[PDB]
Design a binder for this molecule. Sequence first.
Ligand SMILES: Cc1cc2nc3c(=O)[nH]c(=O)nc-3n(C[C@H](O)[C@H](O)[C@H](O)COP(=O)(O)OP(=O)(O)OC[C@H]3O[C@@H](n4cnc5c(N)ncnc54)[C@H](O)[C@@H]3O)c2cc1C
Ligand SMILES: [Mg+2]
Ligand SMILES: [Mg+2]
Length: 309
Amino acid sequence: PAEQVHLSGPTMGTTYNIKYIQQPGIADSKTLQTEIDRLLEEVNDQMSTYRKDSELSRFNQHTSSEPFAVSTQTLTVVKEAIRLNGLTEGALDVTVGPLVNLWGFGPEARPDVVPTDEELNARRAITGIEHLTIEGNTLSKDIPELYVDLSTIAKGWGVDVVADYLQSQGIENYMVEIGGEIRLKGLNRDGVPWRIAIEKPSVDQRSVQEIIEPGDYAIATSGDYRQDGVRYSHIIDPTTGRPINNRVVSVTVLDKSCMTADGLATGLMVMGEERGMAVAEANQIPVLMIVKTDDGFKEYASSSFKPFL
Ligand SMILES: Cc1cc2nc3c(=O)[nH]c(=O)nc-3n(C[C@H](O)[C@H](O)[C@H](O)COP(=O)(O)OP(=O)(O)OC[C@H]3O[C@@H](n4cnc5c(N)ncnc54)[C@H](O)[C@@H]3O)c2cc1C
Ligand SMILES: [Mg+2]
Ligand SMILES: [Mg+2]
């Protein structure tokens, strides 16, 4: 009878949940949790916008055009952010920091008063992926006020870092989950591939879960299924400088990398269902987008997502 261990703790303003299947010859749960906590604290010390002395915050505080050296891990995540910026036609843009902060979703204290068009325009003027370059093991910013936010991607990165640690310890059956971003390998305590739920919105407002088995894959979801006014959310449209205003309720992406799935889910959400599903089709990305229609909801699954339903 297979023994599942559940580890939980705090990271990145949220909680992680790791489940794995005990096998002969592996480290005890205390040993594993101790290293998992160290790895995730490192991700936070590299890439947290909320820690004033993180590598990323020190880059945000840096004012020179002069190259700023960063860790291999930060470099890997920023390179992926830039790659996914190209793939999403500019939709995923980690230099939207100033706008995320303006709207109340970052470390900056904001009032309940809506920003003026003048304040918004000032923050838009100091955003844009074009301002950020990678040179060897360094970042450079061609404007001093550039503020990079890796909230959209470094969670997936932490999931990948922990998944690789569990593999390094000879654990081949696991679920790593941080703030809802997941990576799975092998089989659950019942000997079947791990089960995740996709939340479906319903016109009757009843909670509907679809349970799928992704197999050896990462899964990331952006948006929350949960009156008709101004749209206000933490996902910013880089073209408007404002919270996204489109029909997209949620986007679920599968990828071998949780980092990659995380960036893609947010990027495709900002693109909208037409341009987003077109990118998913052209690039063999398994995606499910739920969109609000005139009198209900509709799903769009890419060709590479069809199997999983
Ligand atoms: C390393 C790390 C440390 C964190 N530490 C803290 C903490 O100390 N305290 C705390 O309260 N929260 C913390 N957070 C949480 C963070 O502020 C976000 O709330 C969270 O990461 C949102 O994740 P999500 O999966 O819901 O968002 P996703 O949908 O995956 O991405 C949305 C987030 O990305 C950013 N963003 C918005 N629009 C875009 C865009 N078009 N392109 C690119 N990025 C965009 C914004 O930060 C937004 O919240 C941390 C996150 C990370 C990754
Ligand atoms: Mg994301
Ligand atoms: Mg995310």
